[model samples]
Target: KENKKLLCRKCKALACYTADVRVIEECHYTVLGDAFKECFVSRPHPKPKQFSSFEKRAKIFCARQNCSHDWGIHVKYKTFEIPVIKIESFVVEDIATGVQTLYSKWKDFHFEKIPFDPAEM
Candidate 1:
C-alpha cells in the first residue's frame, strides 16, 4: 500500500477554500468521502437506465501538452440514447462582498446526489 498523509480534523489544510481540490483527487472512494469529514462531528449509492452504465469513465488530457486541447480527468456515463440527469443551475454568491454567482440549482444536481446513490448523502 502507498503511504499517504492523513488529514486531521483540525488541520488548516482541511479548510473548505482549498480542501475541495483534495476531495476530487486524494480523498477516499466514497460517494461523499472527505466532504463532511471535518464539518462538525460525524460525516457521511445507484442506478440503471436504458441498460447503459459506465462504472467510472474517466480520462486525463493536458491542453499544454497537446495542441488540440488539454483536458484533465474526463469521466462520462450514459451515452447513445441513455437517459441522463439534467442540470438546471446552482449558484453561490458573496453577499458581504456583493459578488453574484449562478450554479447547478436542480434537485438532481445536489452535491452528494450527482455522482452517487442518494442514500449516501
Candidate 2:
C-alpha cells in the first residue's frame, strides 16, 4: 500500500526571507539589535546580493525565528540498518492547563481487540 501520513507531522510554522532595516533613531537601532538575532551568516544557501543591506537583515532574522526550529523531523531508512524517526516541536500547554494535542491515528489501525481485564492489571 502507498504510504500516507498527516501533514502536521511534517510542517513548518514560518517562512524566512531577506528584508530592509532602518535605524532612524538611537533607540530604534538599539531596540532592533536587541530584539533580533541574525542567522544570515550561517545560511547554507546563497541569496541575492541585494540582501546585503541593513533593512534586509531584520527581515531575514524574523523569518528564521518563526520557521527555523518551531517544528520538523529527521528520518533514516536502510535495508540492513534499523529505521529511526525523530519528532521535534514545541508545546505551549501542559498538565496544569489540561491541554492536549493529538498527532497520529494509530488507534484507527484495527488489530484483534485484546480483551481488557482488571484482574490481569
TM-score of each: 0.21, 0.17
What are the per-residue Cα lDDT tens digits for candidate 2 across 1-121?
2112211122332121111122221112111122223321122224323311112211221234334432211111111111011122322122344343333322332222233222322
Best by TM-score: 1
Relative to the true structure, candidate 1 reaches a TM of 0.21
Give the winner by lDDT: 1
Q: Write the per-residue lDDT of candidate 1 for residues 8-93, one digit (tens) a residue.
A: 21221221221122222222122134443332231011221222233333322211212212112222332211112112111222
Worst 10 residues of 2 by lDDT: 75-84
Minimal lDDT window, size 10, model 1: 81-90
**Cα lDDT of model 2 overall?**
0.22
Off by over 4 Å in 2: 1-31, 38-47, 51-66, 69-121
Model 1 lDDT, full chain set = 0.24
Candidate 1, residue 54: lDDT:
38
